[PDB]
Design a protein around this ligand. Structure first.
Ligand SMILES: *[C@@H]1O[C@H](CO)[C@@H](O)[C@H](O)[C@H]1NC(C)=O
Ligand SMILES: OCCN(CCO)CCO
Length: 246
């Protein structure tokens, strides 16, 4: 299990937390020096528990699927909460068994459904470490509309940061002041699966992508990614979704 304390947090300690989160995910191989997440893990080993603590020291524990870095659910005091989706339902067989009750949220965990439930897209929800403190505080007492927005923050500050160094750095820039995500950040979040697939396919195509991935860059410009020499592959992406799940 991995942990993070907002009390005393700084860019360096968040950086270390994201490094621990990445190093908690198992892999048997690397593809262009990037950890390749496992196609499958059976039973309880499929789930990592992230313990998050707000400024005041209250905690939630988040269950994360180690094969895709998807948040399945979380535990706040004695109540467990899971997305309304089969994967999460399964995960509820293995984690937080001791919760006094289990609530299924009224939405699945994908960004489209969360944005609907929250009533606004990601583009307009500020993220950062203070947003993450708020999110943990929100998740402590059930409120489904507010939780949707908290979950969008949680996702992007934990899973998306683990996936991409550029997003980790965005959050480090927002250690003491929230700000809406950059376009580039949204683009990468949306392209993870596609990037992962093409990087895997490039191994057998001399590092060349079968189909190029279009992204938005640091500057706000459309850019086309065609091979593993791109900075997105050499520097940015940190974990690959196994094509066995694409
Ligand atoms: C590989 O990608 C780099 C960076 O995007 C680019 O300059 C180059 O033209 C690409 N090479 C090939 C063979 O497509
Ligand atoms: O259950 C899906 C949860 N998942 C959705 C991603 O858009 C969050 C984890 O990164």
């Amino acid at each position: 299990d991995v942990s993070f304390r907002l009390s005393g947090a700084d860019p360096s300690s968040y950086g270390m937390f994201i490094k621990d989160l990445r190093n908690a995910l198992p892999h048997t191989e690397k593809v262009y020096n990037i950890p390749l997440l496992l196609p499958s893990v059976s039973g309880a080993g499929r789930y990592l528990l992230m313990h998050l603590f707000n400024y005041d020291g209250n905690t939630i524990t988040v269950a994360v699927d180690v094969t895709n870095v998807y948040i399945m659910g979380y535990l706040a005091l004695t109540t467990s909460y899971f997305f309304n989706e089969p994967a999460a339902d399964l995960a509820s067989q293995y984690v937080f068994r001791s919760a006094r009750r289990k609530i299924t949220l009224p939405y699945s965990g994908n960004y489209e459904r969360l944005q609907i439930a929250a009533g606004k897209p990601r583009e307009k929800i500020p993220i950062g470490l203070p947003a993450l403190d708020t999110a943990i505080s929100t998740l402590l007492h059930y409120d489904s509309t507010a939780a949707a927005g908290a979950l969008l923050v949680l996702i992007q500050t934990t899973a998306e940061a683990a996936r991409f160094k550029y997003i980790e750095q965005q959050i480090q820039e927002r250690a003491y002041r929230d700000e809406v995500p950059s376009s580039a950040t949204i683009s990468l979040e949306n392209s993870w699966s596609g990037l992962s697939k093409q990087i895997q396919l490039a191994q057998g195509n001399n590092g060349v992508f079968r189909t190029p991935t279009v992204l938005v860059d640091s500057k706000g410009n459309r850019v086309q990614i065609t091979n593993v020499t791109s900075n997105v592959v050499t520097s940015n992406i940190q974990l690959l979704l196994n094509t066995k799940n694409i």
